Structure 1
Amino acid sequence: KLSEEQQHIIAILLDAHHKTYDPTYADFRDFRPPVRMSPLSMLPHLADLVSYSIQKVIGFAKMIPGFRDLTSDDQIVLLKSSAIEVIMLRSNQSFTMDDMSWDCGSQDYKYDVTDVSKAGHTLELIEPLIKFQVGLKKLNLHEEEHVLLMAICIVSPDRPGVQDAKLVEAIQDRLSNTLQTYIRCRHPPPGSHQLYAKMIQKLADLRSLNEEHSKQYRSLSFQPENSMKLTPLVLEVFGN
């Protein structure tokens, strides 16, 4: 039996995502134009996209039930850690199997492996990242499943710097229980099979992905000339 509270949680999350995510991608025009040629020509455009994406994730985080109860410091630590992971998860929607690329409705706004490479990221990140997207795509999650995973991802007790793990864990648990009930009640087999476990595994993959990004950001950021290309929020969230 799917709970009334649980249905409520799902409805909030779908709206939060709808409010914070645009299928149109119109805002992309505002970012400095993509240059595909030239080293790191692209990064200026992608640095902007990551910065834009972080803002969108923050808006989504505010909606999640029980996020507000957490202290501001707890909110900050969670957002700082999961921002890259949430962006990778949310991106999946744009991402397409046909070209192995993130498709934003334009050739300019269509991003591929060599595009990501121009930003200044080693394959060490890219090959696992592409793989991740294919696996996430294979899952063919319901939008409710997609929204729930992002929130569960954001509200993790074990994120570094967390002042209050017990409170953060309780918020996460409510979402985890909501997701588990949805798959059983609302997901038909065979897709439903092992579905929660696979989704949880993706969170594990994200942690590894996140670690790789930090190693890459440090390298790319290490030089001041490159650190200049990034936005002030990217600097605040990732490093400075």
Structure 2
Amino acid sequence: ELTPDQQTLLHFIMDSYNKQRMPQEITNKILKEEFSAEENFLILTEMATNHVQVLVEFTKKLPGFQTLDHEDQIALLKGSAVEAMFLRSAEIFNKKLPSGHSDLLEERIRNSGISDEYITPMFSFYKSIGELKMTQEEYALLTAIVILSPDRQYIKDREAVEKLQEPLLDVLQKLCKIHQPENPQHFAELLGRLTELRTFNHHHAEMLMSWRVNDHKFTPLLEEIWDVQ
């Protein structure tokens, strides 16, 4: 059973999620540009600033977001930006999106000044995620439920976020029975991988500082959402 409320809700989210595409002229740079450490970082920076914009536009459409406390609206974006960005790339690597150019994207990530410490677990995570064999609807809902985490730092009205989140967890919960009655513990596996995804918040802050002390800079938008000083 999937409630009618939950079917419309779900298709509405697929609207937002499908609508989130970044232009080809931008993503073609993953394949097109020279491969050197400096160009690799530049391109990752550019895919990221572009992606953040798309992120915001997706979050905006999330039902009831536009009627949240403004201060909390920001606390969520900053809170979820990394986790959401890691899921998007997980989808690219696992689903082999043409426009993601995954093999070349991996080459660029592997030579952009990131410590092995972080590369190893990052790719372990992507591998595990793929093994869940998630649909596009699941990637989409997880991103939605990640953005609307009520446990982020500096949220005032926690319960008001719970209310926006709980329905999406419910819909995902169902999809996990309905699109996989074979494996029972599928939904729980997803949630565990979310915990695993949380650990990348700390890695990413060290990644940023390493980059910065080696005189890389980001964009003003990234600098805001990632809190670069």
State the TM-score, normalizing by the size of structure 1: 0.85
Q: Which residue is 1:234 aligned to?
A: 222
1:106-145 superposed Cα distances (whole Å, 9 cap, x missing partner): 59x8212x52133221122211111111111111112221
Within 2, Cα distance between the matches of 1:10 and 1:105? 24
| 1:75-224 paired onto structure 2 within 5 Å | 75-96=73-94, 104=99, 110-112=104-106, 114-184=107-177, 186-190=178-182, 192-223=183-214
What's the CA shift string for 1:23-77, capped at 9, x where partnerless? Answer: x74432478x74323x544111111111111111111111222222211211111
Root mean square deviation, CA, Å: 2.4
Question: Residue 149 of structure 1: CA displacement?
Answer: 0.7
Inter-CA distance 46–196: structure 2 relative to 1 (3 Å threshold): same
Matched pairs, number? 227
- The match for 1:9 is 9
> Residue 216 of structure 1 aligns to a residue in which SS?
helix
Q: Which structure is higher in helix share?
A: 2
CA distance in 1, matches of 2:119, 2:77: 23
Identity of aligned residues (%): 29
1:74 aligns with 2:72: yes
CA distance in 1, matches of 2:138, 2:121: 22
Which residue does the alignment assign to 2:34?
Answer: 35
Q: Indicate how the Cα distance of structure 1 residues 117 and 14 shifts in structure 2: closer, same or farther if over 3 A, else same.
A: same
CA contact (8 A) 2:59 2:147 kept: yes
Q: Give the whole-Å Cα distance in 2 for the aligned partners of 1:44 and 1:103.
A: 21
Query: Is 1:46 matched up with 2:44?
Result: yes
1:226 partner letter: H
CA gap of 1:213–1:103, structure 2 versus 1, over 3 A, is farther
The 8 Å contact of residues 150 and 161 in structure 2, kept in 1 or not, is answered as yes
